[PDB]
């Protein structure tokens, strides 16, 4: 009961540390130069340092990974905060990607074995709700702290990191088949091809349609996060029914494409534009679904499965936004059809199960 509560704070810190850099970066984007290609490289640092290093966590996972990774996060983020020049920030984001791609398999694996055979409800619902809570509260916390001594937010998430060591070392205690991996590992990429390509561009699709000042869209998406959290807390009923393992993903994808289709024809900012935020609920029942699926293929050694998630979901989350930004200009509605396309691709790939279930 307390090990798991200590454990969530690591993941909360990782994604709050991704979210805390947004309201401080423009302060020294002008103090270092940092042209467009340099900023794209700074983004890709975290991507290709999370990519290959994450399966290695599952290579090593069979306690120790979480604590070394969290020291790595704190050191990484301090050295980001030092901020000499690009030669420092680039390697800082690389080692930070190392840390956040080593702790994420460590947590995503070790929850899957300490928790009892009801491992879905509290455990994975809150592990994929605290992720969104960190993404929300990143800029929200960073707003107050960036006003005073703009370096302060950074090592703030630095200082907490050291705290997140001690709780995770004294309040907690310790106690093959590449073919079967194929079904979700490609699957989790496909949605991450477009879902990311959706989310990244939601602040540009609904500023060229009905006008959204930055506060209104923030209200829309905070509401989406809250009313998606309040649905993935009672997630255990919905997964205990709906033919647990794999069927649920298909129904969520059909729901999402339906509400996207309804979204393409929505004017009227407050009535039928704001309220259609509920689309993201259909995209927030699937991340716990694939994480549980990964934890359920591998009987032991859940670290490998969590790592194989956290590498290719980051591959999708990196490939997608570039494509969506590139082909956004040829339309205004281009991001939506990417999400529709990948959702129907997901529907196609999940219904392959019946032929696969017909043989072993």
């Amino acid at each position, epitope marked *: 009961n307390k090990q798991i509560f200590v454990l969530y704070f690591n993941i909360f810190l990782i994604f709050l540390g991704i979210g805390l850099v947004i309201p401080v970066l423009p302060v020294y984007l*002008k103090d270092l*130069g940092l*042209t*467009g290609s340099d*900023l794209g490289l700074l983004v890709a640092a975290f991507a290709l340092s999370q990519m290959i290093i994450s399966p290695f966590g599952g290579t090593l996972a069979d306690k120790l990974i979480i604590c070394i990774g969290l020291i790595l996060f704190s050191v990484s983020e301090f050295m980001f905060a030092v901020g000499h020049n690009f030669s420092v920030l680039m390697l800082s984001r690389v080692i930070g990607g190392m840390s956040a791609g080593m702790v994420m398999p460590g947590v995503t694996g070790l929850i899957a074995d300490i928790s009892p055979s009801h491992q879905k409800a509290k455990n994975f619902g809150y592990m994929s709700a605290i992720i969104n809570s960190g993404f929300i509260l990143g*800029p929200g916390i960073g707003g107050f702290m960036a006003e005073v001594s703009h370096r302060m937010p950074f090592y703030f998430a630095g200082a907490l990191g050291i705290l997140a060591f001690i709780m995770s070392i004294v309040l907690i205690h310790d106690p093959i088949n590449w073919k079967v991996f194929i079904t979700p590992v490609i699957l989790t990429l496909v949605l991450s091809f477009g879902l990311s390509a959706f989310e990244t561009l939601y*602040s540009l699709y609904t500023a060229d349609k009905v006008n959204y000042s930055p506060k209104d869209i923030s209200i829309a998406i905070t509401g989406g996060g809250i009313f998606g959290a309040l649905f993935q807390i009672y997630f255990f009923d919905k997964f205990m029914k709906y033919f647990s393992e794999l069927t649920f993903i298909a129904w969520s994808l059909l729901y999402s494409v339906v509400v996207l289709i309804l979204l393409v024809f929505a004017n009227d900012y407050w009535s039928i534009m704001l309220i259609s935020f509920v689309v993201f609920i259909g995209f927030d029942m699937i991340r716990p679904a694939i994480t549980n699926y990964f934890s359920n293929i591998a009987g032991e050694r859940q670290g490998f499965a969590g790592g194989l998630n956290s590498t290719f979901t980051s591959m999708g989350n990196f490939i997608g936004p570039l494509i969506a930004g590139a082909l956004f200009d040829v339309h205004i509605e281009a991001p939506i059809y990417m999400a529709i396309g990948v959702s129907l691709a997901g529907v196609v790939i999940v219904l392959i199960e019946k032929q696969h279930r017909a043989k072993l």
Partner: antibody
Amino acid sequence: EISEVQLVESGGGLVQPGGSLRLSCAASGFTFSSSSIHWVRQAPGKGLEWVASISSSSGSTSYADSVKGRFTISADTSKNTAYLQMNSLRAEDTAVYYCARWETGYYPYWRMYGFYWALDYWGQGTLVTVFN
Amino acid sequence: IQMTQSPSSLSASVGDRVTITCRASQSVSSAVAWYQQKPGKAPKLLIYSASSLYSGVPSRFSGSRSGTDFTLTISSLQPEDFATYYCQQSSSSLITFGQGTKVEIKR
């Protein structure tokens, strides 16, 4: 705000129509390897008008339609500068050619509103005078 | 492509509100900037991508997208805000400036 990027230009002066100037916008203080260079101009009295451009790496020399074909713009990353040819001069080309640099992007953050940035840097300009 | 900009002379006393509007010939994007040029110096950039203040710029220079009617709004003019204001369209690699708006003091 701690910035010292200075763009300088040199090479104006009196000409004859059909002459050949070649205007050096000697960049400084930045990684020329990945940036844009834009050449604007201002006739005496009127308002600004864009006449050439170049992307230093992985780009093509975009031009203005009214004065396309009489200029050959090229950027030499070796000596940290960028030049612009000057051929078949007409009386409509007396001007004050600034050398400018612009970028603009978006740093997105997961279905919130993240960023915008401009980076802005301009020059000083050389009076180019035409038919005498 | 053109970028019609109106009006071409403002005689506004110190501390009052002014509004300058550009009308793109085609709806391009949220990509418009709003330079200003002091007499005989270089243009500086004030607002980029149609809404975002530049660093080191007073908070009065509040821009506003409106359909294709990109606008710049100064709440109050001050003795350092009396110079020509240009608006630039950053289209697909065919840049075009505006016809030019002047701002002049009242006696």
